[PDB]
Amino acid sequence: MKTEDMVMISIDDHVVEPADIFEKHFPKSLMDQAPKLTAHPRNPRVQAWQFQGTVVGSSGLNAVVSWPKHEWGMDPTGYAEMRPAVYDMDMRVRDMDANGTLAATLFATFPGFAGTHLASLPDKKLSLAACRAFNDWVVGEVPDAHPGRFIPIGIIPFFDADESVAEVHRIAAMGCRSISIPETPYGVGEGFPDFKSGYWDPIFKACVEHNIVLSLHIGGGINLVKRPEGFDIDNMLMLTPLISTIAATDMMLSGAFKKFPDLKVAMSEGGVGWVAPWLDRLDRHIVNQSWTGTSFLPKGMTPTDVWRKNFLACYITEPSGLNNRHRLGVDTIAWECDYPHSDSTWPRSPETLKSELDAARCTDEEVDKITFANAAKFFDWDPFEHIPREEATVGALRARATDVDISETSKEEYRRRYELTHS
């Protein structure tokens, strides 16, 4: 197979919500309490969202596409500095065309990719309104404005189980395929109930009823880990995506799959390699403990069986990861772009992934599984409903974007263009 004939669905990307999202979707009677854009306290030159006495904005590692690498950093950033495609979905699909990406899966910024910023705030009626307004935009408006380009994923008001169940039903009917939930809830704020407590069971139940995937995105497990005093960016960047073992262990040992055997879990941005040693240890534990007469799994299943039925490993780039694909089961590995994060392979995702696939001796069947078919089955999404397959390939989408400039562009030049646009 040629690079140009790949079909690529990404099951993990990120969106910066545009400035009018709450003007358009917050309840009118609550509008004077809606999230509003203000200058960041540490950067009058960039805006951020003020909500319930808090201000939050985008990190400068999470919207870096096309920036020179020396401009990447932890400091807050904002619309003026960003390539417009990070916040303008009309421009986003053009960047996706240029990268050969058929579909993307948009994790939230302002509410938290798992909704934890809304869950941290004291007025839960206000936080609930903000959750529903966000879902109305990212689940309803965006996928319908760009049919076939976005896999609908939302968040829930997980501080309130009954309201979370209601929201699952509500966004299921809007086409929601996944909800992003905190991967290690006991690590969030003061702590929320863990998966073993039963607190999440009505949410798990409603998701199974709608075939909705739980996306457990990295970023929670790192907050569990004590570090030495001096903040080491490089150390954090190294550990943060390599410890999905914690949340996956929690979910496996919670008994969730014995109670809900059809429950689906995607370990978003977790990579591949962590799975193999973890399954080896779990598999051996179940064998060695079979004398107890019970386990956290449905009867007659090994951990590897449950991996293959209920889990999806998700990765951007990991050349050695595919050397255990037969251990895991090749059906359980899905690619992601992670646009516009520092870890994204944009705008060379096809070439970068194809080189790894070729070095791992992937067959064409395996290429298709990893680049789109595993994700499409797991998220119950038809990639060619709105865009025929011959028009959905890397080569065909790139042919629509020969005019898209993908060269390195300073955040200062985006700012100059932004200031010209808004005067």
For its own copies, the binding residues in 36-75 under the rule CB under 8 A are 69-70
Question: Which residues make Cβ contacts (< 8 Å) with residue 219, sequence separation at least 6?
Answer: 113, 114, 183, 240
Q: How far is the CB of 203 from Mn ion (least distance, A)?
A: 22
330 sits near its own copies (criterion: CB under 8 A): no
Nearest to 272 by CA among 319, 219, 338: 319
147 sits near its own copies (criterion: CB under 8 A): no
Which one of Mn ion, its own copies, none interacts with residue 382, CB within 5 to 8 A by kind?
A: none
Distance of CA 347 to the CA centre of its chain: 18
Q: How far is the CB of 239 from its own copies (least distance, A)?
A: 6
User: For binding to Mn ion (CB under 5 A), which residues are involved?
Assistant: 12, 269, 338, 341, 343
Strand partners, 113: none
Among 285, 308, 348, 400, interactor with its own copies by CB under 8 A:
285
272 sits near its own copies (criterion: CB under 8 A): yes
Cβ closest to its own copies, residue 24 vs residue 227: 227
Count, residues near its own copies per rule CB under 8 A: 54
**DSSP state, residue 38:** E
- For residue 45, the surrounding DSSP H or E stretch is strand 43-51
Q: How far is the CB of 141 from its own copies (least distance, A)?
A: 35
Q: Is the C-alpha dihedral spanning 79, 85, 87, 89 positive or negative? A: positive
Is the CB of residue 267 less than 8 Å from the CB of residue 248? yes
Q: How far is the CB of 159 from Mn ion (least distance, A)?
A: 23
409 sits near its own copies (criterion: CB under 8 A): no
348 sits near its own copies (criterion: CB under 8 A): no
3-state secondary structure 384-399: CCCCCHHHCCHHHHHC
327 sits near its own copies (criterion: CB under 8 A): yes
360 sits near its own copies (criterion: CB under 8 A): no
Give CA torsion, residues 58, 61, 64, 67, to 10 deg.
Answer: 120
Span of 91-99, 155-163, 241-249, 384-392 interacting with its own copies by CB under 8 A:
241-249
Nearest to 87 by CA among 142, 152, 31, 38: 142
302 sits near its own copies (criterion: CB under 8 A): no
Which one of its own copies, Mn ion, none interacts with residue 4, CB within 5 to 8 A by kind?
A: none
C-alpha to C-alpha distance for 210 and 189, rounded to whole angstroms: 29
C-alpha to C-alpha distance for 192 and 151, rounded to whole angstroms: 28
Encode 358-394: b = buried (16+ Cβ within 10 Å), e = exposed. Answer: eebebeeebbbbbbbbbbbebbebebeeebeeeebbb
Q: How far is the CB of 235 from its own copies (least distance, A)?
A: 5
224 sits near its own copies (criterion: CB under 8 A): yes
182 sits near its own copies (criterion: CB under 8 A): no
Q: How far is the CB of 339 from Mn ion (least distance, A)?
A: 9
Among 98, 279, 334, 370, interactor with its own copies by CB under 8 A:
279
Which one of its own copies, Mn ion, none interacts with residue 243, CB within 5 to 8 A by kind?
A: its own copies
Q: Is the C-alpha dihedral spanning 157, 184, 220, 277 positive or negative? A: negative
**Structure tokens of 381?**
């999404």
Which one of its own copies, Mn ion, none interacts with residue 37, CB within 5 to 8 A by kind?
A: none
C-alpha to C-alpha distance for 111 and 139, rounded to whole angstroms: 14
Cβ closest to Mn ion, residue 126 vs residue 370: 370
Which one of Mn ion, its own copies, none interacts with residue 12, CB within 5 to 8 A by kind?
A: Mn ion
Interface residues with its own copies (CB under 8 A)? Answer: 69-70, 186-187, 191, 194, 196-197, 224-230, 232, 234-235, 237-239, 241-243, 245-246, 249-250, 253, 271-274, 276-282, 284-285, 288-289, 291, 296, 317-321, 323-324, 327
